[PDB]
Design a protein around this ligand. Sequence first.
Ligand SMILES: CC(C)(C)OC(=O)[C@@H](N)CCC(N)=O
Ligand SMILES: [Zn+2]
Length: 321
Amino acid sequence: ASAWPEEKNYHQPAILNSSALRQIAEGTSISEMWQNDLQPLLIERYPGSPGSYAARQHIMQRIQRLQADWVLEIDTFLSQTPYGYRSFSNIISTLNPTAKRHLVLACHYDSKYFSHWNNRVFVGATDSAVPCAMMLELARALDKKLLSLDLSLQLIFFDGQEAFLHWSPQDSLYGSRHLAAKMASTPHPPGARGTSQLHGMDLLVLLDLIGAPNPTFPNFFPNSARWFERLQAIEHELHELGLLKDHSLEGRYFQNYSYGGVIQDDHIPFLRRGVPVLHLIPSPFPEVWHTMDDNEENLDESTIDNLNKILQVFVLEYLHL
Ligand SMILES: CC(C)(C)OC(=O)[C@@H](N)CCC(N)=O
Ligand SMILES: [Zn+2]
């Protein structure tokens, strides 16, 4: 039996030199992302709504225009909810579908349901319109390098992350609970006898609640800590080369501390099935968490810009591009 599923345990990154780093920093455009990827997503988009459909089309359209050979799949399913049976649609974008191993970046594109209050609508700017846009900007910014692509890249935009009422084991993580179970029972690579698509998940990098000022991301798991350190190293180098905006080491995003317990998110259904996770959610959460103020006005542009550069470098180094 092949031990390829163990390759992830020994995988090392291909570190970019100073020259390559300035190039990545110059390759991403925060204003471009803002107008073309984020704003169309700042709409009410709870599951089943017109917005959900519009968001899903935007994400697909934005990926299809790229040169990289992206394969888009809409994973639609039914699930019981506090309001009865409903339909959900996860969006999966994969480069090299048969590539045994894949680095996976993810977030949820649905927005928590709230009945209109004082003519205000909840759009979950940091939760998680920004993460969505960041993934799209990354796809755009590294498009040329990704075009050259047994390890590849995959993006997952989960639907139904939010609870329709208040968090509950049965009410929340609809999309991820469904996709995890599905991938866990789908042979991979095609024709495989005893390995699943989950065996193929090298690492799940989940972005959530990003876009607020001064985020502090803690290290959550020992089996992905070496990767958390890479993010620290990248942030440090990008900073020393003066490639970050209004950024200080004292107030850096990736600090030297782990988090005791765990935070409920889309990674749970995967983590509980053995998938290594790098959970990029800040602790504490943005002040605007689940408030009508989690809007565009309260987003920190330079912070998102800095994070884009960091994430993009991490991905290129992980994929040896
Ligand atoms: C629905 C649940 C509670 C699972 O997740 C969220 O609200 C995430 N937006 C943020 C993560 C969190 N646990 O607050
Ligand atoms: Zn939320």
